[PDB]
């Protein structure tokens, strides 16, 4: 006896117990309850356009330094406001106030990454031009 029924007519009990105990998985519970749809402002999607509202300098968590220069963005999809990192050396000069930026996940399925507090999204495109190709000298952002 190992604390669970073994009998040949105990399949229903075993599957009911498994059903009850599967709720303790974070992934399974999230998938069944649809948390990514209600919460997690991105509607179960990796990608979303939004409109910048302000440039902000966020102090990294200890023992770090060097504020990360993120932007507050208003999502066109549903209307929520999210703060998004602009990942490159500098590269904030290429994103302006009240500009359209594409936002993607920040690498941890939520769970704000690194020393940046409360930032769970990053910028992929600005004004429709690639943020990486605009940090590089390949392309240029259209006048706005």
């Amino acid at each position: 006896g190992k604390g669970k029924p073994r009998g040949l007519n105990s399949a229903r009990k075993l599957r009911v117990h498994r059903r009850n105990n599967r709720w303790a998985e974070n992934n399974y519970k999230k998938r069944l309850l649809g948390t990514a749809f209600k919460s997690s402002p991105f509607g179960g999607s990796s990608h979303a356009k939004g409109i910048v509202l302000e440039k902000l300098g966020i102090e990294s968590k200890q023992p770090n330094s060097a504020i990360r220069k993120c932007v507050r963005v208003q999502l066109i999809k549903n209307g929520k406001k999210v703060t998004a990192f602009v990942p490159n050396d500098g590269c904030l000069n290429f994103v302006d106030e009240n500009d359209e930026v594409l936002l993607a996940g920040f690498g941890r399925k939520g769970k704000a990454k690194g020393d940046i507090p409360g930032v769970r999204f990053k910028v992929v495109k600005v004004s429709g031009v690639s943020l990486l190709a605009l940090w590089k000298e390949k392309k240029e952002k259209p006048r706005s």
């Binding site: 440039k55 504020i67 220069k69 050396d89 500098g90 904030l92 000069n93």
Partner: protein
């Protein structure tokens, strides 16, 4: 504070490109790697080494 977004990338000296011979792309590059690594040319440094000092 903001407005320091170019403190190192922009305002510190920028070394440009350097005209260099092209690499032999493809199977030629694989042959180059094979000869540089596995015919026992002088890069071993005891067991294995792939850069100088």
């Amino acid at each position: 504070s903001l407005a320091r977004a170019g403190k190192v990338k922009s305002q510190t000296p920028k070394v440009e490109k350097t005209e260099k011979p092209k690499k032999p792309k493809g199977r030629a590059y694989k042959r180059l790697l094979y000869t540089r690594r596995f015919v026992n040319v002088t890069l071993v440094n005891g067991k294995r080494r792939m850069n100088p000092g």
